[PDB]
């Protein structure tokens, strides 16, 4: 060898981009093997490594570059989580619909299959992964991260104490989730109540027998109907989430 | 691949799912409504003579429908897996 | 042992545990839905933990790392000089009963200071008082969701609507009543306030 | 390798097996809630184990490691000198029936010393007694939560309110009753008391 | 590669697979609980395997290791002389049907002695017989817990109390019944007795 | 490259894939149980591989090793003479449709003999054919356990007794049915019989 | 040690293949233990079969003349870089290339990628993950249909708590056998990869 | 927690449940005393009550949360 | 620990459960019997003026009983959790 | 293996399942109809004297049927597991 | 182990289960029939004065039966777990 002196000089942006890729919803969802992700981040870092300063950790304070690596891992994981709650918006929307259809009788035991999310949660997650990938989304994040090294680059790092923002994160996620399925949810509710009137009008209507087949037949239809609007409902949400990333890194 | 294409695909999937579920379930739902008839004629407030006929009719419906439902699904799957390399780009 | 070292040494001596337990109770207290996924729940709890440990870690950096950017000392007393602030922080929240219990169950020798001279008797006391407080907060935040479950179920059986599983109806009501009351600013503020002395 | 060896030797001869299992029963005995994560339960039980093993490890350090900071011997009789205290400790809690059963199933020779000449026949008897006693304790600490569950279900069913799933309603009641009786100091006390001779 | 091979060896050529599987069935047969953790179950099965192979390992050390502390031979016939005891032992427990089936599917050449000239045809027959016997034992030790489950579910439904999840109410009755009959000493004695000729 | 060498070459070119996949489809087809641990399953698949690859390895040691205990050649044509047996063996089992597909997708030159000149076009063919056959066998052995599952669930529902998790009641009926029909010798003989030309 | 396997995952076909197979293992019944150790080997054999023309050209231009002690650690390495370079260029989407030229900010190269190849590799792997997730969800959809039909039939049977994944696994396997399943997917991978 | 406090909170919550369920169900009870109607009365009651009941529950939830830190100890 | 001791414990548990359930429920049952009075005087075949008073009285009974029921349960739990290390062996 | 063969197999499975379920359940359903008789003669609007006899008759039916149902299933399983290597190809 | 032996074992299990369920449930069923008496004398069409006595009698029956039911089950379990190594082969 006798050449590994400049390749390990920076060593910091590698950790930042690795931390982003591990906590991202598409690149880092365990369908990609860790070798691919690690070496992908290595490639991205030999791309972006020009035009950035270094602040070497070389050898002082038995390990101090470890403090600095912790700083950068925190920043990158913050990015990843900030745009992960974005996908969890649609995860939560799909799962509210799935539960209301009647696919969540695994709740009040916890010996069970679980509230089946592979059936609907994976469905909407695939929706969003596709749409996100076809938008500039998967790309803009990278651009965002580049500007990161010019707003809070390295050194003192000026990490931040703003975590509160993304700690308040899931809130709007829940909120956003509602505004996606509100036209569906209400419908389902009515159906339930509608069927309820039947049970009130004619007794001995056992509605493990009749209630849930009807609710599922109509819930699939309602899913198909809301899937029409899903795109025009999605478009502003991605904009808001990418601006959230933009201000999370560009500010401070 | 455009978001429009993703919506195309999920409309295929969801319409196929809802038509399969209707085809499989509606006879069981109707037999449930008929045992509801029976329990409403005489005040038989029972819990399981409403489940057994529904299961019997569901299994009979599976057996009867069977091959042509499987064929519909097979060439839906074949359409998808033959069109993949085009809709990629 | 480095993989077992992280949670036990750091995640135990911090705010993480009561935050993550309150978040899990919430995920259960909330509509029956799962998948806030305990993968963004863990990240969210970790970032709350960092925001809350900001003053603690500031003191730690002041007294340990600020003089030790300069190759001063390695693996010796400075570790105790950094143990001091986190030890006092942990004392600030451990109940008197649990400290008394562990001093009784150790039987070594009455330490003069209220702080336990070894850390390994203060950390489990901290964790027990921590779980107690976390279950306190959890019961508290569960109360109104139980109220909504009861109200909806009462109305549902009151309309002769049996077998409709009023939890399936109460999930949207739960999340609506959880969003109108702003939900998460509240709960996260309660955690961040109950944790420190304001 | 090390992950194959450390768990068995260090968590089956020690108190860990009794503690963690009990805690797990707790996590089931308590409201249906999962996610005290069995990763803070593991660390908490590990601290309680190091805290109960304190006299045992003190005596091992005195009998083996105190003279062996001076390069005296390696991989010889010192290992048996260290085995003796843990052997007597394990014997103190192994039920007589289990030792009799294993001496019967080995059939080798009648060894009069209470400690089994091989640790390989005393350890399984200790682990079986540990499982039996941990199930005893976990069932004990389960009973009152079953009481709360049955009371809640009977009240709901008595309000004509079926299908409200009395378990989701019982969860905050279980948490409340488990906090008001101090919950965790109680159970840590029972473990650390029943395990040793007081 | 040997690192990945050895544990498969200690499982297939020894008692392990009969024990752990039974224990596994128990962890399912017993209350719905997980976390006896299959890491103390694995260690306990390893200890039972050592305790049961004590005579086999004794004969191995007699015929192989006792003369080979003096640099006698390496990687040669001594390995075969060590194969003979474990080979006869495995033969002691393979059902005749499995050996017949594997001699039939090998078709190489008929051997007069019951022992199969290759170890590689004997091991799979031993493993098949082992899994068959392990599932027999596991099902036998499952039956009574099924009885308790049906009893509790039938009582719950018989109080009109649907949707109480009889498994959650049955977990303590399972644990009590499994400690009153002594539970673990029974099953471990059954495993260690059915394994050899007593 | 040894870790990408051994398990890639010899665990795909031999019978390992279909056996291990059928055993996994079984472990899931059998009662919901995990912990046959996929480790004793990997070992049992490896020994069934050694047992089925017996004639192939015999021919390999005939045409390759038997003259090459005598330092004849190295890293040359003897490797191709060793590829010949495994190549024709693989050809004996790849479906015609698959070899057609891969000759079509290669487009290089129409090789006269059925096996294309290199192995890198036959191995993916063999693996796809093996996966298709393994899924055929796995589904075929799954069907009856699905029948038991549906019957047990239907009987639990028809007893008005839902929420009892028919999988936990079906696990013993599955194990019993899988022991009475002898279960394991059936499936192992099926693998080793459908594998080769009897 | 891990430097050599790295450049094979990034530059060659390995990434999208192993990703589609991981989707499958997940797309299929919940089953694990296709073990990702025979999936890695199967994807590596498919990588060899697909890189056959690329590796053929590499051996042509680099290794054929370099059995004869010609040159070492010099321009021959770039003569070997050229074929894999244009191969990767054939599949990187235009957007990723534009973006990485934008992020490098170096001398303008709208013509093919920068010679160091350092700014084509990540663009290739990004377009690779994109196309791999495309195909993955494409083959995942019908298994979702089966999951939903199974779960909705089971609930419509009033028969809950049966974990419809354990009942959907055999139907997934059956449908994946009837449509022949694996040849479809491997042909799709090896055809959508290059120009046909 | 000093169980007195827990009983206090539980009494508060039970009284709120009583208030809400009464306000919602008593009008239907009266209209059923006079006589599909009762469901219509429930709908009318929901709409006519509307914001102020949700606002009182919002006040109570806000109060619970804003009080948690002190009730802990 | 003897099976006799296990029966002791479950007799504690079941007697506590039945007395708690009686204490909580019997007033609601009595108000149900009284609305049954009311519906029997005039032929009011109704379905929910029998549920509302029962729920109101159940919640009022919880509020009233409250602290002393909680105390009974607390020191039952305290008895159990203090006697565990003795009844172990 | 043809899709026709897959339909053959699933027709075996589903007919066996429906006949097993009928054999096991129909007596319980009939005893439920008979307790419905009893509750219809005198206006006993009850909820569980309709469950207990159904469970008793289900368990008695299992005990009685027992061995020959097990034999039917055993040699169905034996047919499947002996025909696998032929229907493979 | 013969299929005959498996049928032996399941006959043990199912007879024990049905006798346990009868012993535990029949008094509750009888108290339900008696509250049905009460609701049939005066036209009290009620829903829960039929559940409360049934639960009280079920818990009282558990408390009373208790030890000897536990003993029956204990030595059934002991019979099974002592006979396992013989019925294996």
Numbering used by the authors:
A (entry chain F): 10 to 261
B (entry chain G), I (entry chain J), J (entry chain H), K (entry chain I): 1 to 89
C (entry chain E), D (entry chain D), E (entry chain C), F (entry chain B): 53 to 250
G (entry chain A): 55 to 250
H (entry chain K): 1 to 35, 52 to 89
The authors write:
Type-three secretion system (T3SS) are multi-megadalton protein complexes that are capable of bridging from the bacterial cytoplasm to the extracellular space. At the core of the secretion system is the highly conserved export apparatus (EA), which is made up of five predicted transmembrane (TM) proteins (SctR, SctS, SctT, SctU and SctV in the vT3SS; FliP, FliQ, FliR, FlhB and FlhA in the fT3SS). Here we present the structure of the TM region of FlhB bound to the FliPQR complex, in addition to the structures of the FliPQR complex from Vibrio mimicus and Pseudomonas savastanoi.
To further analyse the structural conservation and stoichiometry of the EA core FliPQR, we chose the homologous complexes from the fT3SS of two other bacterial species for structural studies: the V. mimicus polar flagellum FliPQR complex, which has a longer FliP sequence including an N-terminal domain conserved in the Vibrionales order, and the P. savastanoi FliPQR complex, which is a mixture of FliP5Q5R1 and FliP5Q4R1 complexes by native mass spectrometry. We determined the structures of both complexes using single-particle cryo-electron microscopy (cryo-EM) analysis to 4.1 Å and 3.5 Å, respectively. Both structures are highly similar to S. typhimurium FliPQR9 (root-mean-square deviation (RMSD) = 1.6 Å over all chains) and S. flexneri SctRST (V. mimicus FliPQR and SctRST RMSD = 1.9 Å and P. savastanoi FliPQR and SctRST RMSD = 2.3 Å). Furthermore, our native mass spectrometry had also demonstrated that a small proportion of the P. savastanoi FliPQR complex contained five copies of FliQ, with the predicted fifth FliQ-binding site beginning to encroach on the predicted FlhB interaction site. Consistent with our previous native mass spectrometry data, the structure of P. savastanoi revealed an additional FliQ subunit in the complex. In the P. savastanoi structure, FliQ5 binds the remaining FliP subunit in the same way as in the other FliP–FliQ units. In fact, the hairpin composed of FlhB helices 1 and 2 is bound to the site occupied by FliQ5 in our P. savastanoi FliPQR structure, packing on FliP5, whereas helices 3 and 4 pack on FliR. Thus, the presence of FliQ5 would block binding of FlhB, suggesting that the fifth FliQ binds to the complex in a non-native manner due to the absence of FlhB in the overexpression system.
